[PDB]
Amino acid sequence: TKQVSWKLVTQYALDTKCEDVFLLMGMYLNFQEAPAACAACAAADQPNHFNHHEKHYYNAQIFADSKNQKSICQQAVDTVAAKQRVDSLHMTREEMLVERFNFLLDKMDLIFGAHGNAVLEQYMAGVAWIHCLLPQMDTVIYEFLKCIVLNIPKKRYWLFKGPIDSGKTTLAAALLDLCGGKSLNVNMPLERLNFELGVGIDQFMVVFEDVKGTGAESRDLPSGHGISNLDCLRDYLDGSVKVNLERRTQVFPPGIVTMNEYSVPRTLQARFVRQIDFRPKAYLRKSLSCSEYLLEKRILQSGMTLLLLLIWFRPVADFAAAIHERIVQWKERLDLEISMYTFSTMKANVGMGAPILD
Amino acid sequence: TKQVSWKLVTQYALDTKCEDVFLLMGMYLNFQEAPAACAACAAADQPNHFNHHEKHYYNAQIFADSKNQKSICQQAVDTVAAKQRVDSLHMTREEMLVERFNFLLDKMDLIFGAHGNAVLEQYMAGVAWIHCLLPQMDTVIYEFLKCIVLNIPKKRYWLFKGPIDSGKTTLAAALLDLCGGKSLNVNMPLERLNFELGVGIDQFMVVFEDVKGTGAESRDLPSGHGISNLDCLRDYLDGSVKVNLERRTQVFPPGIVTMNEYSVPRTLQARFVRQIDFRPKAYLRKSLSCSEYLLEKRILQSGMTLLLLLIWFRPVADFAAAIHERIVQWKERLDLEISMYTFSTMKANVGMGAPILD
Amino acid sequence: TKQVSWKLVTQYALDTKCEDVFLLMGMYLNFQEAPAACAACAAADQPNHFNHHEKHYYNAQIFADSKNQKSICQQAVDTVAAKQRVDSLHMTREEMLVERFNFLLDKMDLIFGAHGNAVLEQYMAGVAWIHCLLPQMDTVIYEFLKCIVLNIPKKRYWLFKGPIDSGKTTLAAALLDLCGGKSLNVNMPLERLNFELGVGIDQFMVVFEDVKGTGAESRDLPSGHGISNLDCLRDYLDGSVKVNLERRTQVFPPGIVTMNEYSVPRTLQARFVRQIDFRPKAYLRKSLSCSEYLLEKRILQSGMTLLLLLIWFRPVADFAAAIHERIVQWKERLDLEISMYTFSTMKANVGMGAPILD
Amino acid sequence: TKQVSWKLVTQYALDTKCEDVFLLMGMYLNFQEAPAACAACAAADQPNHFNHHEKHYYNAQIFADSKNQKSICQQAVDTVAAKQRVDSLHMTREEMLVERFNFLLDKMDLIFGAHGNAVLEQYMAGVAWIHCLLPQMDTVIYEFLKCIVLNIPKKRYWLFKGPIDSGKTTLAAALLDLCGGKSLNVNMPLERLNFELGVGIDQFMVVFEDVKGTGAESRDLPSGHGISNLDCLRDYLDGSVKVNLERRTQVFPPGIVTMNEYSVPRTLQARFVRQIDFRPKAYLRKSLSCSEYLLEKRILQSGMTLLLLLIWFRPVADFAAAIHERIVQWKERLDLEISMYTFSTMKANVGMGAPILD
Amino acid sequence: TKQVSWKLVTQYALDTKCEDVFLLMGMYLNFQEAPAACAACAAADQPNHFNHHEKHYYNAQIFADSKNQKSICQQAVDTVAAKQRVDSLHMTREEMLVERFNFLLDKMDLIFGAHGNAVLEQYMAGVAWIHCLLPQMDTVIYEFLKCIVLNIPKKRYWLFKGPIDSGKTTLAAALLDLCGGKSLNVNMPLERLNFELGVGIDQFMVVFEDVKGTGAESRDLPSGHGISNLDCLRDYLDGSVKVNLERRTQVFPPGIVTMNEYSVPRTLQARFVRQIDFRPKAYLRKSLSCSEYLLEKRILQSGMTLLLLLIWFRPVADFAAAIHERIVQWKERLDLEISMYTFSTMKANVGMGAPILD
Numbered sequence A, B, C, D, E: 001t002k003q004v005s006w007k008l009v010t011q012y013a014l015d016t017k018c019e020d021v022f023l024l025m026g027m028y029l030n031f032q033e034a035p036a037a038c039a040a041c042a043a044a045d046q047p048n049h050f051n052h053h054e055k056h057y058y059n060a061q062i063f064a065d066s067k068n069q070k071s072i073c074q075q076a077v078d079t080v081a082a083k084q085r086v087d088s089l090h091m092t093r094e095e096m097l098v099e100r101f102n103f104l105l106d107k108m109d110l111i112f113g114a115h116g117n118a119v120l121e122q123y124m125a126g127v128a129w130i131h132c133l134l135p136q137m138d139t140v141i142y143e144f145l146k147c148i149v150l151n152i153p154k155k156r157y158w159l160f161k162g163p164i165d166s167g168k169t170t171l172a173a174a175l176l177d178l179c180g181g182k183s184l185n186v187n188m189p190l191e192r193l194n195f196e197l198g199v200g201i202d203q204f205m206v207v208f209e210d211v212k213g214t215g216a217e218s219r220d221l222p223s224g225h226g227i228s229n230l231d232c233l234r235d236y237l238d239g240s241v242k243v244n245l246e247r248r249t250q251v252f253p254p255g256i257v258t259m260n261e262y263s264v265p266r267t268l269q270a271r272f273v274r275q276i277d278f279r280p281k282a283y284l285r286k287s288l289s290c291s292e293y294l295l296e297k298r299i300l301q302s303g304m305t306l307l308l309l310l311i312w313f314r315p316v317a318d319f320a321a322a323i324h325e326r327i328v329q330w331k332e333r334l335d336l337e338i339s340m341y342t343f344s345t346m347k348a349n350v351g352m353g354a355p356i357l358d
């Protein structure tokens, strides 16, 4: 009998950055049918499927007859975690952000392409709104990325502080996506916290989302163990030394802490290089109600939007040389659909609390 | 010696959407006896058995001699979870509702068919009662389905609020079945909650059934951690971002929250696009007591009844093209047994608190 | 077919002191490509890769085709833990410190070498600052190392006591790195403590980092179970007998306890042979702000810096004979870049709170 | 291909009483190199290595190529636990103490031999100090050993009661080592206690080290669940019946309970056949400060010292016939280095709080 | 190569009623040496070894070379648990007591035989003391055995109530041994209790040893959850129905409950068919102090002593026909060493608080 090439199954896992055994099992199996008569190949909308179907068709036919499908898939997913551990130690943080930028760019190529469905002018309308949320937003995003790549101790955490629906969550969400980090919850007690800080292992950045304080109940704010728990994690936030995470020994990743208006202890405040104070501007919310497509299509919280922001505002030099061809081609695509004159118009419509696109 | 085709066992699992190793083991084994002399084949009431017996008879004879039955079955059930992960990412939410609609329709074909036992006029009597429970109920159900398919953030949760035996539970039950979601319990403390929110992984929708509040004990209402727990799950309900579920990383599924008359916090209230206030109407309960067959046959809480409601009221265009032939044939079946004139009569009998069928 | 030499995979694990299955899996796999056309070989910056690529190229080609990659890697990592248990019993504590010194020295050879990026004069600037933090710092570090090697009961624990940003943490961090120990947390309750003291198994030294007391809340100090927990661990700290650790039976390793200004019980105070009282000197902090490169490059907390301190100040006799050639060559490298005259100048700039390097 | 003799790996485990899989893996592996060119063989200081290297050289060469090293080692360690269970039932308690005495004697042969480093006159200086700690100390140690071998119910527990640094801990430590028992902690709550009493399975004796009471906080004594927990363990201490230990069903082993000056309940006091009241004598501590080598070399708490005490004081008849040749030869070794006249001088120096050796 | 007969290893496990994998591993291994030159065979004191050595010598030689020793032993121990489950359902309770009686009798044959060490007149001295503890003690023991065999609901529990050192514990211990039951602890909270009641699965009888009450602290009695926990276990004690034990579904075994003088609730008191009130008689304790050999040799708490009591007092008819030959021969052995005249003398010495044997 024939024998499955585990190495080739493993190749696909690597090529698609598959961290899911089950997803790899069903994804590989869909490759057993003939590509010449394949509808998902004809549709050309799942690159993880149409770019790989011809390469894995015979191997997937063998795989379909295996008694050992999960075991083959476990080794593959394990090779992915292995490749990840290698890079977390071998790769420079700039090399890691380029790798992330390519991910968003591949996704962008697809959804804004021939077989995609997303509308670029809608995302550009989003870029405008985002650029209206803070003064020098292009520099605000750029300084954050630099902050994360450099990852300098006591100078790698940004605190987002504002009330509900003031942009803080959305910016944190969008920045987390742009970097490709993970979101943490520190409102649980010290006991369960150690396994939750483990979600930080081999991560480029992290966002401690919606950190809650105490005694602020008199202000319609929930009491939580967040600020106290974070106050303890001095070694984590500072990143002067390597911490001992459980779920590895490494410098805890840099990122963002988001919270409502709670009192920050003197000690926890000293842990932030930067504090942005988000406040609700009536014009921003009115415009969004008038531009419903943004919320409906989850555009604002997207890293693609923030990559698009940066592609629009920054020269090719402001990006890594390994991705100059990509940026350059995306700059021409933007030029086609939008001009600096019409981009300022978009922002003007935001100030007027009016629909961003006319 | 002969060797079992795991692929063919796996095929059956897929074909019947089997998520149970034990059920697949006993189901496959029943196929070892000769179909020509099979009583369950002659009875033709278990489609999962009579549609598959001829295809798996020789393989099941081999399977019956295997030392590795659970392992063969585990791979099959695993292929099912795999196929599920693939779709949760690849399939459109409309494609997922059609897949569900076909499930209810296959069940309907059977129980209302030659070998079935359920009485269609009894289910139609149920459709009437359901249509009497709310103004524009056809549009109420239709708007919910659209809500779920579109799955728009801050605009994907419906709150059902009413006292005991006022229709809220039954509608939620029936809608949950129609969509094929799961039911959750948030009255437990924050600690056990995380594994319970895991019941949400790869689900089309969810119903947080019987959410309890506090201090309402003075009103014969039980105290519970429900409303507070839900108040914390802002990121879950809104679905603006991907949450981290444990039992996957995904947008938490949309659905319904059901509760008795408890005070809803300003923050938890802002999470609902729609709030339906169920109140006990004497005529509805009297009619049901007069129509005992509905409760006895679990007709009201059935998605089949709500599919039947929609087949009765909506034109073929209001359904997906992939299921037009099915709807069309079911429309002719309804025409045979019921007329618009007699359907209004059914509703008239409900208003009179009288037996729905005469 | 060909068969992987597990012994050779195991060899690499030993040679690189790999305690990580995943890291060994991805590290071995990177050896499958041809060394002659290998970019990581041409770059010559990952010694764990370029020193081993030619030796493991054919074996890694076989490994790449294995179905048993994790199992092969588990045996290797297990041989490492085995080799560690052997030494913890067979090796003299001086032999263990030399082994550690070689580790820092190999790292130093690389980062200060042809393919390295670190700047030696920056680390030397760090040596200066460190030597300004305490009187007779060379003798302070030297006495600690002797303390650890000798590991004499009731005379093997040093207590670092000072406020935030006074050098205590940094010295403890740097000394921990120089020895190659682990850091512990005793602020958790007695229950979870036993598994945390397990982090001490087969360790040369340990640092109980940031031990918290009680009632000192009136002084902006957090309440913690640290001092009480440590007060109980008399048998641990003294090291007169073998304790029973869980995660082995051994003398608990010696080291440091660091704490803010909290009251030390009479009994816990008797457990320390030495107590250094760190106090914030304005000139030290001003100079560091003026020398940002130190903090940015994590130089102060490095054992490499403290090895460099000792290489600068101590004659070849003050080190073990097994590493005389290394010390001697590093002494010539330092002579080239720095003189005693310019080293005193560096210290003079520290006293002036001025940039250490001119 | 060649095949490893598991039986021979198992033999080595038995021969060295190896209860550690990892230690056996690294210990066996060190035997793969040629004994003729082996430095650890030439050094002749690790009997577990030099006595076995020639016997396991070829088998270790095979072992080095095995894919199944941990499994081979697990069976070996399991044979050790098996051999232990056999003896705990088959061996007489005198046979078990001889087996222990041989262990200390083999260790003594080595460290006081050609390749050893320990100084016998230093240990003899220790014997003196120990003999000064209690009247008729030779008879005190002898009566304890008899107590343990006979293991008579309600007459097998000795309570050591004294303040910090009064000899109680050291005697308990030394006696525990002489017998080869284990140390227990009963200051934890009843819940975790059952698994901790499991440390007692197949043990010759146990020491409940540093048992704490309550309300004695007014006397600078820590509150603990020790005395109460022990008060419950009537069936354990008495040893009239077989208890049900969890980690076996057996009589709980006899031994010592050590505590500071806390009130002993009437019921817990009735459980002790003997109570020795240790009190700090200024001369004993002064002499020890003057003889630093004792503390530094962990001589006092050693069973070797107490075996040496007994070899010095007791005639060959006072020991088991199976070890008469060993005792006799050790008696000649002592005669060479020490006389009764100079031993009394050592004790005289203790009374004077002066260095024991002149 | 040769292959081990697992069936024969399994045979030995059955033959010796081995419930311990490790004990079976070391016990089987001791059979590898030649019986003709075997010292344990020549000694003839371990029947589990000398009766089986010749039968398992060749198989044990094969076993010694196995890689699969624990697995072979696990199947054997499993066959024992299997044989036990079979009997718990198939065997009559009289058949189970005979099986137990044979166990004590085999042990008696050995220790009172040619190679034994126990002195029969010492055990007979014990029989006397035991017969002095209660009026009609032969009938008291006999009625208990009948009680246990019949196992009639609400009429199968005996409550032993008395203070410390009044005979209650010793009688319960001795009766538990005679029946071959297990001892339980109900002083723990309801949570851990369910796994502890699991110790009752496939048991002939159980003793809830030292059950503690509350509020009796004013009487130097410890507070405990015993009496309350037992009060809940109505279905357990009564044995009218089958309970659901966890560690099986069966009637919970009958036995004894022992407690100090605590108040028994009306409901818990109704659960006892019999209550014996043990009180300290000065003559009984004085005699025991005068007969130290009894306590030292654990004679009183032995089932062998109570079997010996019954062999002395009861005619052959009072025992099961399957063991008449054994009883008859033991009756002749007793006749040889003791007469009714000298047995009454023994009892007379007990009343006088004098040494039982003259």
Ligand SMILES: c1ccc(Oc2ncccc2-c2nc3ccncc3s2)cc1
Pocket (backbone or CB within 6 Å): A133, A165, A166, A167, A168, A170, A279, A280, A281, A282, A284, A285, A288, A289, A295, A300, B154
């Ligand atoms: C409904 C509910 C909420 C809405 O607002 C938003 N929803 C989703 C994401 C962001 C926003 C807003 N961001 C800002 C930032 C600054 N000033 C005001 C706002 S509002 C809009 C409609």
Ligand SMILES: c1ccc(Oc2ncccc2-c2nc3ccncc3s2)cc1
Pocket (backbone or CB within 6 Å): B133, B165, B166, B167, B168, B170, B279, B280, B281, B282, B284, B285, B288, B289, B295, B300
């Ligand atoms: C016994 C117990 C309960 C009953 O009522 C029901 N039982 C089962 C399901 C639903 C209902 C009702 N729904 C409504 C909705 C609106 N007004 C009144 C009702 S009563 C009927 C009989």
Ligand SMILES: c1ccc(Oc2ncccc2-c2nc3ccncc3s2)cc1
Pocket (backbone or CB within 6 Å): A154, C133, C165, C166, C167, C168, C170, C279, C280, C281, C282, C284, C285, C288, C289, C295, C300
């Ligand atoms: C910002 C934040 C903190 C800073 O100080 C430091 N940071 C990192 C590591 C060490 C220090 C200091 N060590 C000492 C020792 C003695 N006197 C004063 C100091 S300050 C400097 C800038």
Ligand SMILES: c1ccc(Oc2ncccc2-c2nc3ccncc3s2)cc1
Pocket (backbone or CB within 6 Å): C154, D133, D165, D166, D167, D168, D170, D279, D280, D281, D282, D284, D285, D288, D289, D295, D300
């Ligand atoms: C430092 C710290 C403690 C010291 O004492 C000791 N250390 C280690 C072990 C034992 C002792 C002592 N044993 C006794 C017994 C009776 N009277 C006095 C003592 S002191 C000595 C120096």
Ligand SMILES: c1ccc(Oc2ncccc2-c2nc3ccncc3s2)cc1
Pocket (backbone or CB within 6 Å): D154, E133, E165, E166, E167, E168, E170, E279, E280, E281, E282, E284, E285, E288, E289, E295, E300
């Ligand atoms: C020491 C400690 C205790 C002792 O008594 C005992 N020891 C062990 C087992 C039983 C007893 C006793 N049983 C009874 C029964 C009735 N009256 C008095 C007693 S005394 C004897 C010595």
Ligand SMILES: [Zn+2]
Pocket (backbone or CB within 6 Å): A034, A035, A038, A039, A040, A041, A042, A049, A050, A053
């Ligand atoms: Zn395709």
Ligand SMILES: [Zn+2]
Pocket (backbone or CB within 6 Å): B034, B035, B038, B039, B040, B041, B042, B049, B050, B053
């Ligand atoms: Zn059939």
Ligand SMILES: [Zn+2]
Pocket (backbone or CB within 6 Å): C034, C035, C038, C039, C040, C041, C042, C049, C050, C053
């Ligand atoms: Zn290379």
Ligand SMILES: [Zn+2]
Pocket (backbone or CB within 6 Å): D034, D035, D038, D039, D040, D041, D042, D049, D050, D053
């Ligand atoms: Zn050697």
Ligand SMILES: [Zn+2]
Pocket (backbone or CB within 6 Å): E034, E035, E038, E039, E040, E041, E042, E049, E050, E053
């Ligand atoms: Zn024998």
